[PDB]
Amino acid sequence: ASVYAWNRKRISNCVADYSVLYNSASFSTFKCYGVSPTKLNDLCFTNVYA
């Protein structure tokens, strides 16, 4: 989407593999706020919004 009209999707009832994103060398940036990017695989969420 265009930034003025950004998309949103809900993630639920699933296993969230965060190492697959964190250790992907293709990202130019990966900055987490309030949580360490390396502890994400050990955490549970109500849901996740992307």
């Binding site: 949580v35 360490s36 390396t38 502890k39 050990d42 955490l43």
Partner: protein, 49 residues
């Protein structure tokens, strides 16, 4: 009520102690009052703050 003086001593100590316990839930500026929520999410350079 005849024994109110003794009951009063008991009530005051109980109240003081319950207050001490309730204070553990205060954040005092923290993201969470729970020490484990801090530890399970942040790396030491931030967790320590």
């Amino acid at each position: 009520s005849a024994l109110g003086k003794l009951q009063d001593v008991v009530n005051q100590n109980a109240q003081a102690l319950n207050t001490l316990v309730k204070q553990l839930s205060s954040n005092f500026g923290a993201i969470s009052s729970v020490l484990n929520d801090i530890l399970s999410r942040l790396d030491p350079p931030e967790a320590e703050v």
